């Protein structure tokens, strides 16, 4: 016969298949996966920043300083929060945190955090500090929230106390105060002497006046009265003044915050770890250069986009058609 030369293409031993718009399950020589399906299954640090586990405490009890909770005094920052949905500790004394939804959102993740003493606990005047069997500390001693001071009568007299805070930090500052509503007018007399006491809280943009709402609540622990805890973000250069003659949980510790609301409160019951990823889900940490993921719609950080899809194979090679 004669000399001959032929043009051809690659064939391999592959079961690799892709779908095209015009055809299903087309054999190809090579392909890649677009969707990330692998994760750590743990809580990791997010881009170099460790989260904060709330232990046995709810966010509410943690943020007001429940003595049974681990203190947040040493915290500098957090990428996200880890909370047990059935946490035993919260507001140890029967009460509610006002507007806690917003606060949760703002404290989901903060890049700059530091507790600070707004007003000296003894600079208020002639009042005593109240502790309770409802808020015992790590020891067993009667105590109270770290961030608040329960002012009561001293020497059978409750004077009109008034202190103010000046935001000089240059950043936003979270302030907490509270109102105690006794079981009866008899108890507010026993605790604060003054009949029908009030608390007036004001900035230069708003002013709130609180009065007592006496009654018996179906409480927990030992008590049957009710506390309402409020909060406000004080902006740089702003000032907030507190004046009261009873039933007043005074501010002591506040928080200096910058770059906040950048996180998430995960309630997932997975384990914390030494790993570090750029994307954290409620199911595990993700570390991939892929831009899609079908693992968990609940994700935070520099993540691949979550999509509702099975694996997607991008063809790189050619149609794998077998040898003549």
């Amino acid at each position: 016969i004669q000399d001959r030369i032929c043009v051809g293409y690659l064939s391999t031993n592959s079961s690799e298949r892709v779908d095209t718009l015009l055809e299903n399950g087309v054999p190809v020589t090579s392909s890649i996966d677009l969707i990330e399906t692998n994760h750590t299954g743990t809580y990791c640090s997010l881009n170099g920043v460790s989260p904060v586990h709330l232990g046995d405490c709810s966010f509410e009890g943690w943020i007001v300083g429940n003595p049974a909770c681990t203190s947040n005094f040493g915290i500098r920052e957090w990428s996200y929060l880890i909370e047990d949905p059935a946490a035993p500790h919260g507001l140890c004394y029967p009460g509610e945190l006002n507007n806690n939804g917003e606060l949760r959102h703002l404290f989901s993740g903060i890049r700059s955090f530091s507790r600070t003493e707004l007003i000296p606990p003894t600079s208020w005047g002639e009042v005593l500090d109240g502790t309770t069997s409802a808020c015992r500390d790590n020891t067993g001693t009667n105590s109270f929230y770290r961030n608040l001071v329960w002012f009561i009568k001293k020497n059978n007299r409750y004077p009109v106390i008034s202190k103010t805070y000046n935001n000089t930090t240059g950043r936003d500052v979270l302030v907490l105060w509270g109102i105690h509503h006794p079981v009866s007018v008899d108890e507010t007399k026993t605790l604060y002497v003054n009949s029908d006491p009030y608390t007036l809280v004001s900035t230069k943009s708003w002013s709130e006046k609180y009065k007592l709402e006496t009654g018996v609540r179906p409480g927990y622990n030992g008590q049957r009265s009710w506390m309402k805890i409020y909060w406000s973000l004080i902006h740089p250069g702003e000032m907030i003044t507190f004046e009261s003659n009873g039933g007043f949980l005074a501010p002591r510790y506040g928080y200096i915050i910058e770059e906040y609301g950048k996180g998430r409160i995960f309630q997932s019951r997975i384990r914390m770890s030494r790993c570090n990823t750029k994307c954290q889900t409620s199911v595990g940490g993700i570390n991939t250069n892929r831009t899609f993921q079908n693992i968990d719609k609940n994700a935070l950080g520099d993540c691949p986009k979550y999509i509702k899809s099975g694996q997607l194979k991008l063809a790189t090679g050619l149609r794998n058609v077998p040898a003549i």
Binding site: G8, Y9, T20, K305, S309, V321
Partner: protein, 165 residues
């Protein structure tokens, strides 16, 4: 579709090393398989650019659209979840369709590449070869191992052979 792959060249070559497109020859002195580094590398560069473009251009923020809510703000909680879900549905459809669309184009690109290679060889040989219509060319003259290379590297001259035909 360009009719080459799984077309008139009805099968692929296992044992084609380090290439997608190539040549198979047979002269008096052997055989005879080699990839065409030129068209293969150019194709590799294109697929790489395509894959990188698809991935690198997604440089936005794609984590969840959600916030923290208490049990008394259910409506705003539901709207946030619905919006996050809707954004997710847009990306889901686009991801699936893009892969289907691009797989279509990738396969046809390969088909076009070997067809262009076949046409390139046919133009070289001109009347010095018979087109068998299966990707093969029957030479009308004898072809050195050197002669085969001049065909493979594009430098084959039909004038320096036209007479033995």
């Amino acid at each position: 579709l360009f009719g080459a792959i799984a077309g008139f060249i009805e099968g692929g070559w296992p044992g084609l090393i380090n290439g997608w497109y190539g040549f198979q020859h047979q002269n008096e002195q052997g055989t005879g398989i080699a990839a065409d580094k030129e068209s293969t590398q150019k194709a590799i560069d294109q697929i790489t650019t395509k894959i990188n473009n698809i991935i690198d251009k997604m440089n936005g923020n794609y984590d969840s659209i959600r916030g923290e809510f208490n049990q008394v703000e259910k409506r705003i909680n539901m709207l946030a979840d619905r919006i996050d879900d809707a954004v997710t549905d847009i990306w889901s459809y686009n991801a699936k369709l893009l892969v289907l669309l691009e797989n279509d184009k990738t396969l046809d690109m390969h088909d076009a590449n070997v067809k262009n290679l076949h046409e390139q060889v046919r133009r070289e040989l001109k009347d010095n070869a018979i087109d068998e219509g299966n990707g093969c060319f029957e030479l009308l003259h004898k072809c050195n191992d050197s002669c085969m290379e001049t065909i493979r590297n594009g430098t084959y001259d039909h004038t320096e052979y036209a007479e033995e035909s």
